[PDB]
Amino acid sequence: GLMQFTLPVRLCKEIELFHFDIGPFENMWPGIFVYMVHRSCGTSCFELEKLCRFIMSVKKNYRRVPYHNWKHAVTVAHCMYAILQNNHTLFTDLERKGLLIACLCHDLDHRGFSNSYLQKFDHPLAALYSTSTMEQHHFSQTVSILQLEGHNIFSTLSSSEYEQVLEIIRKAIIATDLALYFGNRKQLEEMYQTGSLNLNNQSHRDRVIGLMMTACDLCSVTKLWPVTKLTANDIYAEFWAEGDEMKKLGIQPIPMMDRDKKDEVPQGQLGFYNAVAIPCYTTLTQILPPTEPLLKACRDNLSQWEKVIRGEE
Ligand SMILES: [C]N1[N][C]C(C(=O)[N][C]C2=N[C][C]O2)=C1C(=O)[N]C1=NC2=N([C]C(C3=[C][C]=[C][C]=[C]3)=N2)[C]=[C]1
Ligand SMILES: [Mg+2]
Ligand SMILES: [Zn+2]
């Protein structure tokens, strides 16, 4: 019980900041996550034997795809850790528990193809789950891993606490479907402006956790420019593979997925930053003021893409 994970000094300091990169040493990523659980949650939150077994089985169920891989999972959990650590008193013990686990599991068994491609391929998952196809799959994979012998990290919760945390996880993972983000953010926008936003209202908390999940999910745009720029190559390697697979079904893909249109990536990143990323981190910062560093880094990266376009890089 007296066994802390500890990190080298540079990581011990940098892990607290929103723009932390977890590094290229895959074998340190489980320890980093357990470190983040122990500080966010407590050393008592999980049996270490059970947590370590859960983590290794989650790792094994991410695939070797360029972007939606085990690295993304730990990265997305770290951004949640940093939100939770900058908003100590806003979240319950059950929420702190659920959200780190939700972020770690949120893209389980991703194949590097969007919901649209699954529907166009007529994949069996698109028959089983008509909307939020992959996300319903990610949550399905999370429940399966929780039910493997020795992997039930929530075994010590009361029945009703267990139903509540699985409900926090289901809604957190469903919320990573960016098709749902547009409406969720607009409703949060209205609610904050008219002053109806109430964090004692569960339906409002659920909306706020949704936006946190989108923010953590998109957090590649909140890193230092060298990280954002090199992660962009990984995001596009998937998009362009999906484009290729569209052309093999006889469908012209959108330009974002057509490798023949790589030239326009800079203007494509602007659109994304203006239509999704900035609105996301703006409303997050209005609801949760200590998350302002994510909006600041997002805007620094917008200004870097503006420089790429002007030929200065
Ligand atoms: C979903 N998602 N997630 C994440 C992302 C990113 O992306 N994010 C970002 C990042 N950074 C780093 C990493 O990641 C996204 C998107 O969507 N994006 C996007 N992109 C693009 N668009 C368009 C384009 C184009 C390209 C080319 C041509 C034309 C057009 N591109 C839209 C959207
Ligand atoms: Mg996803
Ligand atoms: Zn994701």
Side-chain angles (χ1 to χ4, degrees), residues 7 36 54 58 86 99 113 126 131-132 146 153 175 177 186-187 192 199 219 226-227 234 236 255 262 271 281 288 296:
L7 297 178
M36 287 189 304
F54 177 88
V58 173
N86 281 268
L99 285 186
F113 299 119
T131 73
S132 295
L146 274 177
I153 56 176
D177 175 9
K186 288 149 181 150
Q187 276 278 179
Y192 173 83
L199 298 157
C219 77
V227 177
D234 300 330
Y236 275 104
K262 287 187 204 216
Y281 291 114
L288 289 196
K296 175 187 177 296

Side-chain angles (χ1 to χ4, degrees), residues 62 67-68 72-73 76 103 106-107 110 138 176 213 216-218:
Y62 280 85
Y67 175 79
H68 288 105
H72 171 63
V76 168
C103 282
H106 85 280
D107 276 321
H110 211 286
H138 305 316
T176 56
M213 289 296 297
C216 293
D217 204 15
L218 301 186

Side-chain angles (χ1 to χ4, degrees), residues 80-261:
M80 182 58 69
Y81 165 81
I83 297 178
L84 291 169
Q85 285 307 260
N86 281 268
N87 296 272
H88 191 39
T89 73
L90 282 98
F91 295 98
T92 72
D93 306 30
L94 266 202
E95 290 174 342
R96 285 214 246 81
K97 282 185 197 183
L99 285 186
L100 296 162
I101 294 296
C103 282
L104 194 67
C105 297
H106 85 280
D107 276 321
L108 264 166
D109 196 25
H110 211 286
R111 339 274 176 130
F113 299 119
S114 73
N115 287 337
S116 296
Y117 175 77
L118 279 200
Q119 298 159 21
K120 277 165 187 111
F121 186 81
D122 202 356
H123 192 284
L125 296 176
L128 182 47
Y129 310 122
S130 49
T131 73
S132 295
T133 301
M134 289 302 320
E135 293 83 13
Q136 296 201 66
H137 184 66
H138 305 316
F139 177 69
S140 187
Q141 298 278 278
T142 305
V143 168
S144 296
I145 291 180
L146 274 177
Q147 283 166 178
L148 270 16
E149 264 211 0
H151 288 51
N152 204 284
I153 56 176
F154 296 122
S155 76
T156 88
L157 275 31
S158 88
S159 172
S160 71
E161 293 185 302
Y162 184 102
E163 172 121 26
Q164 287 181 74
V165 81
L166 263 288
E167 198 69 7
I168 290 163
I169 293 160
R170 188 184 55 79
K171 291 165 180 154
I173 297 175
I174 296 309
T176 56
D177 175 9
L178 204 72
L180 302 169
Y181 147 79
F182 295 101
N184 188 44
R185 184 205 67 86
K186 288 149 181 150
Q187 276 278 179
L188 282 176
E189 208 46 50
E190 291 154 38
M191 276 172 205
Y192 173 83
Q193 283 175 349
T194 71
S196 28
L197 186 52
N198 163 33
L199 298 157
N200 296 336
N201 182 327
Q202 187 61 53
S203 67
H204 285 198
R205 272 186 105 64
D206 290 346
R207 289 200 176 276
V208 175
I209 290 155
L211 188 63
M212 289 167 61
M213 289 296 297
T214 306
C216 293
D217 204 15
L218 301 186
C219 77
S220 281
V221 304
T222 76
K223 304 310 190 185
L224 298 190
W225 166 241
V227 177
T228 299
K229 188 191 181 215
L230 285 165
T231 313
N233 293 330
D234 300 330
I235 189 62
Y236 275 104
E238 301 192 352
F239 287 160
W240 297 335
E242 172 168 335
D244 288 350
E245 291 299 325
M246 287 302 184
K247 303 173 185 180
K248 299 179 174 173
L249 287 173
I251 315 183
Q252 257 302 120
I254 65 196
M256 149 182 152
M257 290 182 195
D258 188 348
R259 63 180 69 251
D260 300 336
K261 305 201 169 139

